[PDB]
Curated annotation (Swiss-Prot), chains B, C, E, F:
<dbReference type="GO" id="GO:0019013">
    <property type="term" value="C:viral nucleocapsid"/>
</dbReference>
<keyword id="KW-0687">Ribonucleoprotein</keyword>
<feature type="binding site">
    <location>
        <position position="193"/>
    </location>
    <ligand>
        <name>RNA</name>
    </ligand>
</feature>
<keyword id="KW-1040">Host Golgi apparatus</keyword>
<dbReference type="GO" id="GO:0044172">
    <property type="term" value="C:host cell endoplasmic reticulum-Golgi intermediate compartment"/>
</dbReference>
<feature type="binding site">
    <location>
        <position position="68"/>
    </location>
    <ligand>
        <name>RNA</name>
    </ligand>
</feature>
<dbReference type="InterPro" id="IPR015971">
    <property type="entry name" value="Nucleocapsid_Phlebovirus"/>
</dbReference>
<dbReference type="GO" id="GO:1990904">
    <property type="term" value="C:ribonucleoprotein complex"/>
</dbReference>
<feature type="binding site">
    <location>
        <position position="65"/>
    </location>
    <ligand>
        <name>RNA</name>
    </ligand>
</feature>
<comment type="subunit">
    <text>Homodimer. Homohexamer; ring-shaped, necessary to form the nucleocapsid. Homopentamers; opened pentamers in solution. Binds to viral genomic RNA. Interacts with glycoprotein Gn; this interaction allows packaging of nucleocapsids into virions.</text>
</comment>
<keyword id="KW-1048">Host nucleus</keyword>
<feature type="binding site">
    <location>
        <position position="28"/>
    </location>
    <ligand>
        <name>RNA</name>
    </ligand>
</feature>
<dbReference type="Pfam" id="PF05733">
    <property type="entry name" value="Tenui_N"/>
</dbReference>
<feature type="binding site">
    <location>
        <position position="103"/>
    </location>
    <ligand>
        <name>RNA</name>
    </ligand>
</feature>
<dbReference type="GO" id="GO:0042802">
    <property type="term" value="F:identical protein binding"/>
</dbReference>
<protein>
    <recommendedName>
        <fullName>Nucleoprotein</fullName>
    </recommendedName>
</protein>
<comment type="similarity">
    <text>Belongs to the phlebovirus nucleocapsid protein family.</text>
</comment>
Length: 242, 243, 243, 242, 243, 243
DNA sequence: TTTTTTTTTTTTTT
DNA sequence: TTTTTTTTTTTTTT
């Protein structure tokens, strides 16, 4: 009777039926498309220049705009106050239709990752610090929003190399900005940062082709997707990392 | 007096089959698969199978807290989950023998659940890609706790151990990701929390030994005589040196 | 010159028999085995032996908390445990002396408990396989604290020490598994929790020296003259170098 | 002016003046003389036999007489109840004029330490367990009341040998019976047990001559106070102990 | 073919000067050195320089909590600290920007602070002797976070990196001593707390590149062309292998 | 503008003596010895010296909690302590600059305190015998925190370090015994709590360098030129390898 | 960031 | 003895 669970198992699996359901029940959190829609809406023609300012502001000062405003120059405070009021900026994790410095940096990952080369020594974990862990550490990987640039169709060994090279940074960064991860083990830090990382790697924002074009442009992969010597070095550094 | 009674009681031959029936009957039981199927049929009627398939995808990719997952979901999804909560009177955690949870549905219907893992691989808390980094071509059919429900316990001990150590490589990763209070603990400490539910499913009376080995053969996990595949052997070893 | 012979007499001359009578009279007695068997016969009647066998399997593979174990068990098992709780008025932990617990049943009937361990080996908190990893072909009859009640204290000291060190290898593992705080403590700290109950049963008045040695002989633990087996000798050494 | 603390320092120290003061301000805790006075008072002619019973009772069952009574034989419970009522026994640490099983064992250290040879395998830390740490561990040292048998006039190296040999046991025992010391470091256990140990070693109860006569009788020292091979072995085992 | 050149342009072509203006404009500014000196002159009058010297000694050897330090100090000292608190309206921690703290005084007057370190060396939380154990003849002028304000950012990159790594060896020690939770954390975790304030002062508009290099030359940290000294080179290497 | 003022302020030569006066004046101060003596003389009158001797024995062998020690003391002792509490208005712990404690009395009169240690050696929390086990013939005059008050800081650095490392061997033991919350901490962690009060007493203005070296010479701790004794040298080394 | 004499003998399958 | 998407960037001599 009840061991008819065999008949239920016997039915061949439908890739499209299951893919409709996984799509319907999917975690709906960060919408990069909505963020860009809101920036364009509040900023108008100035949205790009203000977004670049907000990327610098997020990467070097954090996600609390009213707090950072208090320990800043006269000119800076005036710019941040204008941005808070134009873009109706918030702190932390508000509703889906609300903008934060984090969300701006995350939706515009292509622009954020390019800025890291210049901003490297102004970050919580500097390029110099990373170079101590792995020589000539890839600066374009030094932000959680880099996960949105990873082509998931890349050969598994090449893909794992990029993510292990990026995880070397995440391990340092997470232990430093997440109060719950201060001094915790590698395995613990990776268990808290892999699920949001892998969601960004397998998101529908930016096609595989565009993602690999960015990795090629940043000099992270070659013509066939083979990671650079620096990525390979970093990927190994993560395997023996503490 | 009572010493003579203790000797005469011990003088009686050990009944291997009587004790083996009892150890089975009193064994740990995480859920009654038969009661779960009985409840799905009762609440769902003729739609119970299609709704069970939905709940398998829902459990595997979103978890066991239906009202919580509903908060970070689309309008359509939110409506499907709300309808399922109300039809099947779904609960979170470990409720009574007469209550349904997304976990229990996936666990009672292990044969289908394990088959879905091939498609759902990159949407799981621990992806197939991640597992391949630990052990090459990691068996996707093993990437769910309900896989223990498909293991034939009559398999030769060495073959049986290799299947379970392979599966344990996944369990070790999965437990650290889905359970935050197991993240800083050792391999031995994490294994201590997942071996009892695993071994219960392996030694349960739900789905016979013959049918269970037929599944392992079909999933390509064992050969004609029950010898595990190279991938299973590789993962069992990866688990022995795992941290 | 008299004070010298006085400190000499008060230090060297000890009334070994007077002290040995007292230590036995004051020894921890959570229960009297004779009273336990008297209570089983009283509540169970003609079925007391079959129910006692069930309670031994239940105590060895599930523990001493009958209402707790009942919740993660099959429909049939739960119904058997509930029936046993109500017939024998079973309790958890350490109640009064006219009270029965699964532990006390297994302890009073040590002769059958120890015989069941051969069949139940892979269902115990510490399996026979796990023990074999510490000492080859570990004696299964020693894999329960109630084994101490089977030990003949009149055995030659060296033979008696081999039996107890061999049994202590198991106790060391068992205590760490059934008491998680002990996992990070020393052999000496873990030993401190199990040596007093062990030595009390070894020197108890329940079952004579002659019968106790006839059990050790029957279990194949000692020879005709009380010389321990190769497996016992191996286990006794494994304990000396154990951590 | 105020640097006249030099004139205060300049006064030569008086050994007898200081010894009167240390005597007057001394810690007044356990009075072995009062304990024996109370045993004789309540027990009469039976005080010695009842004291021997109470030593066995303390060493193998503890210091809680009403508690131990509940998990004991009919005969034993009857004896313990009679002892509780004759000697007005208490649990824990009551007033100076109150008897406890601990205080009885401690005041009659000579009798207690002799009983350890027979009681060895009934103790929280057995002789067998100790033999695993140091071969043929001295059974007479396996009780805190042994500190009352130590001659403090012994040559420093011989004296330290006896106390290091005894401390090997105290380390095991303290970690086991003191809930606050469960799994703590050697240095921590020794910091909590050295002050009460050293007080018993330097107490006025039992003269130096009698103390050394006991150590000689127990076979712990030779004619000149040189410790035995077992004590020497144990003293070393404590130096490398964890 | 245009989308290719578009991803190429949006990845490689970065407006280095636009971004560098912004990072400087938004940089953490707990205080403006010019405002600190303006406030010292305003409250202190003609005595502002002598009182500032006192506050530098007070900040370097006692900390940033003036009312706290006052309690474990001599009669004369306590009276001096109380007078300074009331004249300069001193605060603890990180107050508003028109507020003075011992730290802000030492930071705005980096040129004298760093010069005082030669005399104050054995009175600091991390002594010169301690530093000499990590790197021989460690540069005493680098033994304060305010040293970063003395660093010329126009220096050749390799020379600039030697100065900062040499200074970071001190910062690593100092942070562990003045923040006890950091003692059990990694170089990278400890570095994360001191690199942002360091790099902000290195790239601040207070004191020109030309003057900053004239300080490094005067302190004997660099030569005529900006090449660091043997001690700086030694300290830069000690930091690379530091734990 | 303010940049030019910062350069001209730094252009002024470093006044070594002005800074050295200030670092002394602002240095940590556990107690004012002068105020303690002033208070003893005020409350005690002509009996202040004899009562101070009593309080030194009381602090050294019983501690700093006078009402607490009174509970485990003789009738006579109890009366002496109660009389001293009421005459000198004695307090426990670390009260105001104008309050007396047994510790402060012993600390302000270090010359006498250190001389008493020879007689009181076997009555201290850490005995002379215990210390001799760590380092042969350990200097008894060093067996009190107030010994730091006798150290000449003008001594050659290597000689000065050997005296303090020797003394630190005792401090390490003493702190673990008198302070229960320092028992599980490392050498570095315990040293972190006792170096600041030690170094304050070493660099205090109470009792000149000349008088302090005269004491070290008298106690046999240094020779004619300040070279420490073999016992001091031995203890300094014992501290380097201490746990 | 301090300040001087341990505590006190049977558990029980997460 | 459990059950699926981190948190969010300046401290300050015990």
């Amino acid at each position: 009777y009840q061991e008819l669970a065999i008949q239920f198992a016997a039915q061949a699996v439908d890739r499209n039926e299951i893919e409709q359901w996984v799509r319907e029940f999917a975690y709906q959190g960060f919408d990069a498309r909505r963020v860009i829609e809101l920036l364009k809406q509040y900023g108008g023609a100035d949205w790009e220049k203000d977004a670049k300012k907000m990327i610098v502001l997020a990467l070097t000062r954090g996600n609390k705009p009213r707090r950072m405003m208090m320990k800043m120059s006269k000119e800076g405070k005036a710019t941040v106050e204008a941005l808070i009021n134009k873009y109706k900026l918030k702190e932390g994790n508000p509703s889906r239709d609300e903008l934060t410095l984090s969300r701006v940096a995350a939706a515009l990952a292509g622009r954020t990752c390019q800025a890291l080369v210049v901003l490297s020594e102004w970050l919580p974990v500097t390029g110099t610090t990373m170079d101590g862990l792995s020589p000539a550490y890839p600066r374009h990987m030094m932000h959680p929003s880099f996960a949105g640039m990873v082509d998931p169709s890349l050969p598994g060994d090449y893909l794992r190399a990029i993510l292990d090279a990026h995880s070397l940074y995440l391990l340092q960064f997470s232990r430093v900005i997440n109060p719950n991860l201060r001094g915790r083990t590698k395995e613990e830090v990776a268990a808290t940062f892999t699920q949001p990382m892998n969601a960004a790697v397998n998101s529908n924002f930016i096609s595989h082709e565009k993602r690999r074009e960015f990795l090629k442009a940043f000099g992270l992969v070659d013509s066939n997707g083979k990671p650079s010597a620096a990525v390979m070095a970093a990927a190994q550094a993560y395997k023996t990392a503490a």
